[PDB]
Symmetry: C3
Subunit: 116 residues, 3 copies
């Protein structure tokens, strides 16, 4: 199993959620966050004075899936979140050693849906 953690533009998140649901990926956890990237370098210019580069709102999506679904989900998120401009976001792939379903106590192979 892996955790896929994606940071995307708020404007694009509804198309990422729809793209995932259309292929049966329903379980997801979402957080409002702020971020910056390289754009702006060390500082910015506010008519006279020096200003820091602003942390701006973004949406964090976390989706935990079986190893055999990781590449499919990365593609769905990349093709729905893309616009072409700096600030489109990044995806991190993090190992998960086990998952427990609270309602049933199922774990391991029984804790996540099989797509294949």
């Amino acid at each position: 199993m892996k955790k896929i953690e994606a940071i995307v533009r708020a404007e694009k998140f509804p198309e990422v959620k729809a793209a995932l649901e259309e292929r049966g990926f329903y379980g997801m956890t979402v957080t409002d966050v702020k971020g910056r990237g390289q754009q702006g370098g060390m500082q910015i210019q506010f008519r006279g004075r020096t200003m820091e580069v602003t942390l701006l709102p973004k949406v964090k999506l976390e989706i935990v899936v079986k190893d055999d679904a990781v590449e499919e989900v990365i593609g769905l998120i990349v093709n729905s979140a893309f616009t072409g401009s700096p600030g489109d976001g990044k995806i991190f792939i993090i190992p998960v050693e086990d998952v427990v379903r609270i309602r049933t106590g199922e774990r391991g192979d029984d804790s996540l849906e099989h797509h294949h």
Copy 2:
């Protein structure tokens, strides 16, 4: 050491927090999040008016502990967060390679 990341109902979170504190598990970080699960499928019903399945509020708990404590913490969370209905949540066990205490610069299970 391991990071235990649990997504629970906001109504159950106080009972999970007390069950952990009773057994000396005091350090924890908590975030307000939203989520959906399998319940609802693709869309739901509001009158020949499809609507999307809503992302609803949940509480995310993160607690980092020694390897030997992981199963005890998982059972304390499951027993206090359970209701039996869809939406009860999930627990993810994630490896941590080290931990640093900012106040002293101490590392290892020591720093926990």
Copy 3:
């Protein structure tokens, strides 16, 4: 590559952000969170009854960096977030198997920062 997840005081966060930027570490994701530590033990009081220990606001910083940069970034955070009182926070180092840049599809140390 590794994910460095640091929980720090809100008052110290602007000094942490400036210390990383000064050394060219620009990419970072920040979340408002709440937390408690050991301080307070099982409970407190009172006027004049017992109460739970309060989960209080903190700032979570996540920065993903190359393996060879981890010890430098740990030093930058410890020195800028330190005050010397209980509640200064903790840094967790979590393995990352890969990173994907959405704009280009590029992966690896390459996709950083």
